[PDB]
Amino acid sequence: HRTAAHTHIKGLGLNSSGIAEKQAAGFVGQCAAREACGVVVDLIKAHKMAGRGVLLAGGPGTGKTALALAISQELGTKIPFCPITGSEIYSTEVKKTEVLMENFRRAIGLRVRETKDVYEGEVTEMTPEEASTLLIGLKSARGQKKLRLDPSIYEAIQKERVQVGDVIYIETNTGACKRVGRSDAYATEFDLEAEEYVPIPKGEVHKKKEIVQDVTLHDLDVANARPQGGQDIISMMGQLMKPKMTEITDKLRMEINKVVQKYINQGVAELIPGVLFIDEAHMLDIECFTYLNKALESPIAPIVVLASNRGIATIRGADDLKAAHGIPPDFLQRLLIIPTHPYEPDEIRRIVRIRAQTEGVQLTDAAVDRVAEHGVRISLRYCLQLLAPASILARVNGRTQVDVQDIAEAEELFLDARRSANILTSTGESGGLHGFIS
Amino acid sequence: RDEPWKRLPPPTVYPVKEARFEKYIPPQLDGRERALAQPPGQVAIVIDNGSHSVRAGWNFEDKPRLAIPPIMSKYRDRKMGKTFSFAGSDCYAARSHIRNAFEAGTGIVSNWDVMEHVLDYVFVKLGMNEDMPIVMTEAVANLPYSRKSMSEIIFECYGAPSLVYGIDSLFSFRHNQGQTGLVVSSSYSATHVIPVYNRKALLSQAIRLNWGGWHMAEYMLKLLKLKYYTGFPGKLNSSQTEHMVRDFCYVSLDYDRELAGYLDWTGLEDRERIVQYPEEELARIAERKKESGRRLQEQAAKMRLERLMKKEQELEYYKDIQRRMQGESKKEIKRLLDEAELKDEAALERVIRDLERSIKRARQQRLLKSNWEARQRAKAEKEAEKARLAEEARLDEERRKNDLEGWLEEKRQLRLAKLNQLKERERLKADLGNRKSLASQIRMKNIANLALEAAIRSLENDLLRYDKTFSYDMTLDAQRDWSKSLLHAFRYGPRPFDPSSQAETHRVHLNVERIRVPEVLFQPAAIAGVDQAGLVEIAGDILCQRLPSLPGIQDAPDAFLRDVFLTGGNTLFQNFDERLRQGLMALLPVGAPLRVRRAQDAILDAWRGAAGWACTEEAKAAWITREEYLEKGGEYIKEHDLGNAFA
Numbered sequence A: 001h002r003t004a005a006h007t008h009i010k011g012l013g014l015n016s017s018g019i020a021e022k023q024a025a026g027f028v029g030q031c032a033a034r035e036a037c038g039v040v041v042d043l044i045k046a047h048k049m050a051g052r053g054v055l056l057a058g059g060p061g062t063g064k065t066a067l068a069l070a071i072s073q074e075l076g077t078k079i080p081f082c083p084i085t086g087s088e089i090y091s092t093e094v095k096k097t098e099v100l101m102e103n104f105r106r107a108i109g110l111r112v113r114e115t116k117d118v119y120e121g122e123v124t125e126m127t128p129e130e131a132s133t134l135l136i137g138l139k140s141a142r143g144q145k146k147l148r149l150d151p152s153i154y155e156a157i158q159k160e161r162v163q164v165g166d167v168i169y170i171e172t173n174t175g176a177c178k179r180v181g182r183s184d185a186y187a188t189e190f191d192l193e194a195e196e197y198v199p200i201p202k203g204e205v206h207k208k209k210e211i212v213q214d215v216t217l218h219d220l221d222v223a224n225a226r227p228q229g230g231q232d233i234i235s236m237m238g239q240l241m242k243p244k245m246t247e248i249t250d251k252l253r254m255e256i257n258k259v260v261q262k263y264i265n266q267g268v269a270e271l272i273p274g275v276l277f278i279d280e281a282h283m284l285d286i287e288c289f290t291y292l293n294k295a296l297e298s299p300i301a302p303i304v305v306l307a308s309n310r311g312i313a314t315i316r317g318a319d320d321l322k323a324a325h326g327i328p329p330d331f332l333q334r335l336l337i338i339p340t341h342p343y344e345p346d347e348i349r350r351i352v353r354i355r356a357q358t359e360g361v362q363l364t365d366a367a368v369d370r371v372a373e374h375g376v377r378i379s380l381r382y383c384l385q386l387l388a389p390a391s392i393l394a395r396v397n398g399r400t401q402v403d404v405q406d407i408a409e410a411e412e413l414f415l416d417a418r419r420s421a422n423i424l425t426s427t428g429e430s431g432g433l434h435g436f437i438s
Numbered sequence B: 001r002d003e004p005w006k007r008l009p010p011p012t013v014y015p016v017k018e019a020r021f022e023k024y025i026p027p028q029l030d031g032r033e034r035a036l037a038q039p040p041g042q043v044a045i046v047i048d049n050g051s052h053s054v055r056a057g058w059n060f061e062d063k064p065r066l067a068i069p070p071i072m073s074k075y076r077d078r079k080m081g082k083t084f085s086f087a088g089s090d091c092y093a094a095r096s097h098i099r100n101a102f103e104a105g106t107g108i109v110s111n112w113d114v115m116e117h118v119l120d121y122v123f124v125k126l127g128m129n130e131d132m133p134i135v136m137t138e139a140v141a142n143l144p145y146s147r148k149s150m151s152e153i154i155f156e157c158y159g160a161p162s163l164v165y166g167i168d169s170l171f172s173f174r175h176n177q178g179q180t181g182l183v184v185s186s187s188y189s190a191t192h193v194i195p196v197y198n199r200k201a202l203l204s205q206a207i208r209l210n211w212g213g214w215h216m217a218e219y220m221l222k223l224l225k226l227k228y229y230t231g232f233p234g235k236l237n238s239s240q241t242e243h244m245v246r247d248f249c250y251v252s253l254d255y256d257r258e259l260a261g262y263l264d265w266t267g268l269e270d271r272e273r274i275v276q277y278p279e280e281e282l283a284r285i286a287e288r289k290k291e292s293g294r295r296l297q298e299q300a301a302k303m304r305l306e307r308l309m310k311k312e313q314e315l316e317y318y319k320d321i322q323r324r325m326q327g328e329s330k331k332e333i334k335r336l337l338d339e340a341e342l343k344d345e346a347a348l349e350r351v352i353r354d355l356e357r358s359i360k361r362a363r364q365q366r367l368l369k370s371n372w373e374a375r376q377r378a379k380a381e382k383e384a385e386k387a388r389l390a391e392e393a394r395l396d397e398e399r400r401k402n403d404l405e406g407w408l409e410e411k412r413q414l415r416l417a418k419l420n421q422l423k424e425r426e427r428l429k430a431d432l433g434n435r436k437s438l439a440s441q442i443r444m445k446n447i448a449n450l451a452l453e454a455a456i457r458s459l460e461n462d463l464l465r466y467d468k469t470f471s472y473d474m475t476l477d478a479q480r481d482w483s484k485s486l487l488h489a490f491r492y493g494p495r496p497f498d499p500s501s502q503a504e505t506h507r508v509h510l511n512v513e514r515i516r517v518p519e520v521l522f523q524p525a526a527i528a529g530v531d532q533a534g535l536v537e538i539a540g541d542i543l544c545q546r547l548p549s550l551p552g553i554q555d556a557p558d559a560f561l562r563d564v565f566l567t568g569g570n571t572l573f574q575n576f577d578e579r580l581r582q583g584l585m586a587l588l589p590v591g592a593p594l595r596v597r598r599a600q601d602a603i604l605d606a607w608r609g610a611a612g613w614a615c616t617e618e619a620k621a622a623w624i625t626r627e628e629y630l631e632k633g634g635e636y637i638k639e640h641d642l643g644n645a646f647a
């Protein structure tokens, strides 16, 4: 349990009728944006979505990404959520219209249920039956058990160095085997052998457990393009033979859709459409808002929550047009735009109290007003970053709770950006030996 | 540290239960009067020929009448002029000429002159004044000569209608109402494992382990003889070790974890089991020691003063030579230095400096003035040295009022240096009792070429007072104390040492012997070196490798695992059936209905089974009458399903 910048966000805090209530689940105020994000969460769960775009306006300091983490904890662990910033789309190995499709294919989720039948235990004998099939007795501390092996899983046992009485761990379903060690009954056969002597497991020999587990479609794309991990031994050279990201063509994705729809029609897997949260979308340039306008029109595309804080700025990559939000109006008509208004002075105090009781820093009511004064007069990100140093100035001076004096000391030890700009301009007047170098 | 034995409770001690006599001589004649009242064919005398305790009685009762050891003893008194010979429990174990009917370590009778008198005592104390059938037990796969000799003693010495031999563990099986199982019976002489299939013993494949309660007693005697190493003032009989094993040993469930953390200090007081065995003159001695001490101090003080005076005289002599050398020619300085046996003026200054440092550290009126001035110089030197030490102490205290860390690092380095010096000395000391050491070779090479504890305590005291990270455990004294060694915990316990008192030296402590001695049944080849297999491994060899490979039986795991029960006398240990159940659970396949239990009256059901068997139709169809002994011979075997194989 360590505090982040969004630890106190638990959920959107809605009613049963989809109406936001003030000071609920960590948020303070911000009604209409939480109502709209609740509608977005219901749209994601409704499974009637093949590409929808949601833009979040509002300047810096307001709660844009807090809404996104509220959505991410409102969906749960089940439905996948991929947060990427705009600046991650640039690479030096692939084009930047292919990393977008890699994020779209990381967004869609594919849930498979398995019943793994694991076999822990000491090998009793290695008897080749036919001349082929090789029986193995797996002795536990509860009883041994015979086991008939396929002639291909035995060539995976045999590659491992399993001889007489090594404890092993056979997966029955997936056919995965690991040699855990040599059993301690055969420990002191010789006296300085070099193995890992482990005791016989004091449980069952046949443990049957079931596991629900997810796979993203991008992992299917990578596992079908290039051999990965298992038998890819020439990758230890590194220079040309490493697993470099390659240009996954449209034909490969068009076939993987066929195969996944085949395994959904058999009732094996389940499909769950995810969320792609692209943050600070002004860093996306015009060679990607062209490609999003195509890639959202697929019948498989996930919902895209874009976040952008800028005003009428210059679209990157094409310097001769200005547009709102850094988003071209060719693309801006698709988006559902949600506003994010600033904070009143009576709605900053509650954020101070919630952020204080998240970090455990308790403080008197004469200091909450001072932190709210710095929140009104300077910024919201700065006033919340004085609750943690002042507690360090509290338990050192023989106190437990934070008073006005510790914050009056921390405002001098920890200057903000505005007073540093004033010192940088006015106090740092002459550019000489002991001056700043503009 | 006084803590580990300050709040320690007073000990709860158990005395020695030696197998003594008991004040009873009954000539019980009330059994023959009841035996002659029953109809014929249903009266028989049953004798369990046990190696530890021969039992005997009539079949129509539940408890045996006589339960005696095979001990006998014969004497002749010349002060009385009479031959004595009594046997059984009437021997006191004051005289002992004891010889037993059974061979020590094996339940095969080979001491027939004792067995004859034991049977004589049995037939006397039952009441025989004149011819009943005899049902008698023997060992598994008995030797034919022993059966021939026993049958010869039964027919020829006493005169009997019929007798029949059987295996006592199988009688306890038949009394326990089993049909098919795996009888594991740990007796006094050997531990048998016998598979029984539909009330029939499969004696072609029964296996006896060569360990038993007598081996328990003898191995316990050997380990108490080797534990108390320097000589224990007490008679260590075998029988008292047997009674120690009977009430102070239990088979541990998980042995390799219980054993390795057994002799830890925390909680040894509850593991350990302990066994008993049956001012004016001080002021005058203190004054004499004070007076002898005063005289030695006075002599030492005189010698010290004399040495100081001699050094002062020598210093004056060399200073005089130094003064005479001031202003003399280089030739006269060499003559004065040669007269003083000195090589150079530098050697003279070194001798004067050394003598001054040593003194600084340390007619009648003329002599008295010279002695008084010498004492004043010595006192002035001592006072100057004391002043110097006091100043150094003050400066050290003043420095301490300042830095402490750098001070602690210096004290740690000084401690390490002194420890290394102690180790180098210990090494030199150990090497001095040795030769190959290069130390004697370097000495011989040199001859051939020619041909602190107080300081450590002082530093530790300083670290204990000022260093919070330095504990008493890190002191040299702590690294040298009983509470550290395990051998005191192994022989004596967590209490302090024996001060050679009356009721303290005569004590035997038991720690490991509780779980080491009854463990030999499962790991024989390692603890006691008997080159055979464990009980678990024998049971697994029979259940998993021989019985499925034997034709004529239906289910090898589905039938023999229904009832595995434990019979013999060497079985009433705490947690003995559970160990065998966990071993067989580790060996058998998963799902076998294993149910290990034990008999009801483990030391007495071997008699009751032959008591209930004695007067049935199968027993009537398995007797050997007298004319059958006269015709068929001696080694004739009625093949019964409990007795051994016919020959």
Ligand SMILES: Nc1ncnc2c1ncn2[C@@H]1O[C@H](COP(=O)(O)OP(=O)(O)OP(=O)(O)O)[C@@H](O)[C@H]1O
Residues within 6 Å of the ligand: B049, B050, B051, B052, B053, B107, B168, B187, B188, B189, B190, B213, B214, B242, B245, B246, B247, B568, B569, B570, B571, B572, B573, B602, B603, B606
């Ligand atoms: N309460 C008890 N706890 C543990 N052991 C006991 C107890 N009582 C008796 N014994 C053990 O039982 C043993 C006696 O067994 P028993 O006399 O039944 O063997 P046995 O039938 O004479 O053997 P065999 O058939 O070979 O002659 C003794 O060694 C004694 O240590």
Ligand SMILES: Nc1ncnc2c1ncn2[C@@H]1O[C@H](COP(=O)(O)OP(=O)(O)O)[C@@H](O)[C@H]1O
Residues within 6 Å of the ligand: A005, A006, A026, A027, A028, A029, A030, A059, A060, A061, A062, A063, A064, A065, A066, A309, A351, A384
């Ligand atoms: N309704 C709210 N309740 C509590 N904290 C909030 C709320 N809205 C914003 N915050 C705070 O704002 C900060 C996040 O600002 P952020 O949304 O990251 O701005 P931007 O999206 O412009 O980078 C977090 O520290 C969070 O504590």
